[PDB]
Ligand binder design. Structure first.
Ligand SMILES: CCCCCCCCO[C@@H]1O[C@H](CO)[C@@H](O)[C@H](O)[C@H]1O
Ligand SMILES: CC(C)C[C@H](N)C(=O)O
Ligand SMILES: CCCCCCCC
Ligand SMILES: CCCCCCCC
Ligand code: NA
Ligand code: NA
Length: 491
């Protein structure tokens, strides 16, 4: 018998753990600070209402609909809606995207674990005062961990501690996934989400008390929420907003679908809305009130924007620890920060590995033990690419996490609302609950959302170390297409 979420709330809490992750505390501050903070929020809100919320309901519908027929993954669920062979091929992306994203997501999550260990024990840089002299020791601290070469070289030389901690991170993910849906993920989400909420609120309160001659914690909140309608015409802001919305809500990652497949009795309208608002609260209230207000309080708005533009990890791994280190007990604040990130990423990595696990369980009839171990071997083996090859992690985040989920999000929209039938999809979404979707969203999900994506997708169009990554992940797609072929012959 297929696994089962014990309670309706347990699925909602695990869905919040799926959504709330490193994108709320690491990706969102960088995206907002890059695109002007407040000027970024208007397209972010519009993208959340026109793309985020509707796609959250759809994927939950396809998952619950497919889960009633014993299928959790997209290759089988796409075929149920569209009885076509090409539907199974496009469904491979629902296994390929979560696999490629988990290759680098779990590794970045291992950094938060390793940093939390050394910050707890107190093995952090020592500063004695220009901002560069406080920020430089922590920049060298991160570069020694992941093994960045001095200047430019195609090969990374990560530390032995980082490689060992990555093994521990893979072991922790397996330990949770090996126990299953109810006894493992649902059990862990009930504990991690309150811990996530308590740590973040404590950090937000501590950050809010920071004040220097150059800035105030409230100055960063004013920078993030004062809108700028002049930058509304910038297409780059709309691209960053929709891409951010896809990432934080786990849209196009095939993770919402498999999670929803383990519960037939569920109001997907209220459950999908609760999980989204829970994620957006942690994103713009908690994640938005830590990194940006602390950076602005110590360096000002102008320098805080330049810091977020220097790198994706420059804020949460370098600037925020160095800022904390200038305060009493800041080494412990650093520990609480990365411990906050570790629980945020751990509850999301187990969510993006279950799709490949559910495929081996449901389509190839493998036991959960063998399913978890085999997908873990795929993730651990492939992770050596992003561990040692410079810019290899950036190529995976682009193809699978950036352009893939947008392409896959439009694909599941068309299959569900255009091929399967808009009225059948509308019936399936609002079925089985007291909360019903307003009728206006029927036109958003049938006309607005697909046109909004397609228009934004075509308006997007305007070192050999990347070819190894392209060559590798292409083989990952061919390998998963092969198993979908094998699972079709067994049936
Ligand atoms: C399935 C493939 C397994 C490959 C295992 C390779 C492990 C290499 O690990 C190496 O150990 C060094 C020890 O100093 C460290 O510098 C680094 O972690 C790494 O270069
Ligand atoms: C599930 C992951 C791919 C994304 C997750 N929502 C995060 O922001 O970390
Ligand atoms: C330290 C010698 C081997 C390092 C390269 C192996 C990584 C797969
Ligand atoms: C001499 C160490 C280089 C290791 C390269 C690893 C490529 C996967
Ligand atoms: Na998120
Ligand atoms: Na999570």
């Amino acid at each position: 018998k297929r696994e089962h979420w014990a309670t309706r709330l347990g699925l909602i809490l695990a869905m919040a753990g799926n959504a709330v992750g490193l994108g709320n505390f690491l990706r969102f501050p960088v995206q907002a600070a890059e695109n002007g903070g407040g000027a970024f929020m208007i397209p972010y809100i519009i993208a959340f209402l026109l793309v985020g919320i509707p796609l959250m309901w759809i994927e939950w519908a396809m998952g619950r609909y497919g889960g009633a027929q014993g299928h959790g993954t997209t290759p089988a669920i796409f075929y149920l809606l569209w009885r076509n062979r090409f539907a199974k091929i496009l469904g491979v992306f629902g296994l390929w995207i979560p696999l490629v994203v988990a290759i680098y997501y779990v590794y970045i999550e291992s950094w938060t674990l390793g940093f939390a260990i050394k910050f707890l024990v107190g093995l952090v840089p020592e500063p004695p005062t220009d901002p560069d002299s406080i920020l430089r020791p922590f920049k060298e601290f991160l570069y020694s961990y992941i093994g960045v070469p001095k200047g430019d070289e195609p090969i990374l030389k990560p530390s032995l501690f980082a490689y060992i901690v990555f093994l521990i991170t893979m072991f922790i993910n397996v330990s949770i996934l090996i126990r299953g849906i109810s006894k493992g993920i649902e059990r862990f989400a009930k504990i991690a989400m309150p811990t996530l909420f308590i740590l973040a609120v404590f950090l937000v309160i501590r950050v809010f008390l920071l004040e220097t001659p150059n800035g105030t914690a409230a100055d960063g909140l004013n920078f993030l929420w004062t809108p700028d309608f002049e930058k509304l015409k910038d297409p780059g802001v709309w691209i960053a907003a929709v891409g951010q919305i896809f990432f934080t809500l786990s849209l196009g990652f095939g993770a919402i679908i498999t999670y929803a497949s383990y519960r037939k009795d569920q109001d997907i309208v209220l459950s999908g809305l609760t999980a989204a608002t829970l994620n957006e609260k942690a994103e713009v209230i908690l994640g938005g009130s830590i990194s940006i207000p602390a950076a602005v309080a110590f360096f000002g708005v102008a320098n805080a924007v330049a810091i977020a533009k220097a790198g994706a990890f420059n804020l949460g791994f370098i600037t925020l620890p160095a800022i904390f280190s200038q305060t009493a007990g800041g080494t412990f604040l650093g520990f609480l920060w990365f411990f906050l990130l570790f629980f945020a990423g751990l509850t999301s990595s187990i969510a993006i590995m279950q799709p490949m696990i559910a495929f081996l369980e449901d389509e190839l009839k493998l036991s959960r033990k063998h399913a978890v171990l085999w997908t873990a071997a795929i993730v651990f083996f492939s992770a050596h690419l992003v561990m040692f090859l410079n810019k290899s992690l950036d190529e995976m985040d682009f193809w699978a996490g950036t352009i893939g989920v947008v392409f896959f999000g439009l694909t599941e929209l068309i299959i569900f609302f255009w091929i399967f039938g808009a009225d059948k999809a509308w019936e399936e979404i609002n079925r089985g609950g007291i909360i019903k979707v307003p009728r206006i969203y029927y036109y958003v999900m049938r006309y607005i959302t697909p046109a909004f994506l397609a228009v934004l997708l075509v308006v997007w169009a305007r070192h050999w170390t990347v070819w190894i990554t392209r060559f590798y992940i292409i083989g990952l797609f061919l390998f998963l297409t092969f198993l979908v072929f094998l699972a079709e012959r067994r049936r």
